[PDB]
Write an enzyme that holds these catalytic residues in place. Structure first.
Site, PDB file in Angstrom:
ATOM      1  CD  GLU A 163      -2.897  -1.169   2.369  1.00 36.55           C
ATOM      2  OE1 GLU A 163      -3.061  -0.307   3.039  1.00 36.55           O
ATOM      3  OE2 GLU A 163      -3.871  -2.016   2.183  1.00 36.55           O
ATOM      4  CD  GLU A 349      -5.500  -4.705   4.284  1.00 41.63           C
ATOM      5  OE1 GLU A 349      -6.181  -3.946   3.546  1.00 41.63           O
ATOM      6  OE2 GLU A 349      -4.952  -4.293   5.029  1.00 41.63           O
TER       7      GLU A 349
HETATM    8  C1  G2F Z   1      -4.597  -2.833   5.269  1.00 42.06           C
HETATM    9  O1  G2F Z   1      -5.519  -2.528   6.152  1.00 42.06           O
HETATM   10  C2  G2F Z   1      -5.425  -2.891   7.311  1.00 42.06           C
HETATM   11  C3  G2F Z   1      -6.840  -2.477   8.375  1.00 42.06           C
HETATM   12  O2  G2F Z   1      -6.738  -1.068   8.253  1.00 42.06           O
HETATM   13  C4  G2F Z   1      -4.092  -2.478   8.093  1.00 42.06           C
HETATM   14  O3  G2F Z   1      -4.130  -3.022   9.581  1.00 42.06           O
HETATM   15  C5  G2F Z   1      -3.162  -3.035   7.272  1.00 42.06           C
HETATM   16  O4  G2F Z   1      -1.708  -3.114   7.799  1.00 42.06           O
HETATM   17  C6  G2F Z   1      -3.219  -2.803   5.964  1.00 42.06           C
HETATM   18  F1  G2F Z   1      -2.178  -3.153   5.153  1.00 42.06           F
END
Ligand code: G2F
Length: 440
Positions: A163, A349
């Site tokens: 990200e 994710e």
């Molecule tokens: C993707 O989103 C989640 C939830 O906000 C985070 O904990 C992760 O680190 C992120 F990669």
């Protein structure tokens, strides 16, 4: 109904969110150590100093993965454990730790999916402008080389960055994540140096690898929909789509930065010479999609950039922090399959936060999270039927953990973590996933 027999089924974590042991075995200071220890930056006054203690308790985490019947684990390596000064000598003790952990995963039949950078930049590099400096991209590639040389005999599937939009925009423009700067130009320069670091690392990793590797990057993508068909609302949707999605997808696909966004940013845009863009477009073996939410966009000319505000839909389900729109996952996957060159695709994710508690019977009755998984998995079957080359799915997260600026107060796990005792317990949704996967 049925997924492919060789589909990857996993859960995901990140080093700073779970490991703790922040001063152990030579670990240096990361920007998130600095940020979490700054008064007022974390909503509940917590830090990642202990978190889930997974540096010591990774064996328990493996036990949970095995109990859930998963076949893969997505986790990150902490750069501060490997090169504590950011650029400098390696810390062999940090490499040995992850080598043992990889061996334990493989011994349990879990395939490691490793992320090199999940936001924990060494603080000495931030002292020299962090992602605002091209030099950070060069030394990121050096770190990638070091890790692949030692672990690439056993790990085939690697992602460079998790990200980059968050690291750049939340960390350098909106100031809500580490390091906490609030400057658009710095955020956009950071976005460029993150992408450059990615491209340099891909090349470095292929040269250092002891066997062929499958290298990807992980992007958060938000499908965007105009609130109406007016020219203003459609343009707002395109601008937001450019701000989050195309700004990263297009240069990775060899299309440069999107011209409409370059025009919109004007003088704040980074100076991208063609040599950099060629490096950024290094060929990838897969792309990871992180999906949580859509954006239904209304023009907001007064608001800050990109001048698009979310139109909340009160009819849709909401979690502790997000709107639920499963069909957006189908939409974004079809768009990637049709319009971009990346394949295969992994969902790296997907998950939700709830106000989970342990009930009198000892279980955690998180029915909304079960429903969340069921609805999103159904959309993946639709995408597969349309020919989208999807190869796996990672639930976020294996266990409740340190959720960045929300601290320990925002629970995303399929397993509950008692932060006082460090006990983990499987939530009802985790047992649903176990039983679903076993049926496949
Ligand atoms: C993707 O989103 C989640 C939830 O906000 C985070 O904990 C992760 O680190 C992120 F990669």
């Amino acid at each position: 109904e049925r997924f492919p027999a060789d589909f990857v089924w996993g859960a995901a974590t990140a080093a700073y969110q779970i490991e703790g042991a922040v001063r152990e075995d030579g670990r240096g200071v990361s920007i998130w150590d600095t940020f979490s220890h700054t008064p007022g930056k974390i909503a509940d006054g917590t830090t990642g100093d202990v978190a889930c203690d997974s540096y010591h308790r990774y064996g328990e985490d493996i036990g949970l993965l095995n109990a859930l019947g998963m076949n893969a684990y997505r986790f990150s390596i902490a750069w501060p454990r490997i090169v504590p000064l950011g650029a400098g000598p390696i810390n062999q003790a940090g490499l040995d730790h992850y080598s043992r952990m990889v061996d334990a995963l493989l011994g349990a039949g879990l395939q490691p999916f490793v992320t090199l950078y999940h936001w924990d930049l060494p603080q000495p590099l931030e002292d020299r402008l962090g992602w605002g400096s091209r030099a950070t991209a060069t030394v990121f590639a050096e770190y990638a080389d070091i890790v692949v040389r030692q672990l690439g005999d056993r790990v085939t599937h690697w992602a460079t960055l998790n990200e980059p939009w968050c690291s750049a925009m939340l960390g350098y423009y909106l100031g809500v994540h580490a390091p906490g700067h609030t400057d658009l130009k710095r955020g956009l320069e950071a976005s460029h140096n993150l992408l450059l670091g990615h491209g340099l690392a891909v090349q470095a990793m292929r040269a250092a690898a002891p066997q062929p590797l499958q290298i990807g990057i992980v992007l958060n993508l938000t499908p965007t929909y105009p609130a109406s068909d007016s020219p203003e609302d459609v343009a707002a949707a395109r601008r937001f789509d450019g701000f989050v999605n195309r700004w990263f997808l297009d240069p990775l696909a060899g299309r440069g930065y999107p011209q409409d966004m370059l025009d919109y940013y004007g003088a704040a845009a980074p100076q991208a010479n063609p040599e950099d863009l060629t490096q950024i477009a290094a060929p990838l073996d897969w792309l990871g999609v992180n999906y949580y939410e859509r954006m239904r966009a209304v023009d907001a000319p007064d608001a800050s950039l990109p001048q698009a505000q979310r139109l909340d839909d009160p009819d849709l389900p909401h979690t502790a922090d997000r709107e639920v729109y499963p069909e957006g996952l189908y939409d974004i996957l079809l768009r990637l399959h049709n319009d971009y060159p990346f394949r295969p695709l992994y969902i790296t994710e997907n998950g939700c936060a709830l106000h989970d508690e342990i009930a009198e019977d000892g279980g955690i009755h998180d029915g909304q999270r079960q429903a969340f998984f069921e609805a999103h998995l159904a959309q993946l079957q639709r995408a597969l039927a349309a020919g989208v080359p999807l190869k796996g799915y990672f639930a976020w997260s294996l266990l409740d953990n340190f959720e960045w600026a929300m601290g320990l107060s925002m629970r995303y796990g399929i397993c509950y973590t008692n932060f006082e005792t460090l006990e983990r317990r499987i939530k009802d949704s985790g047992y649903w996933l176990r039983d679903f996967i076993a049926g496949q």
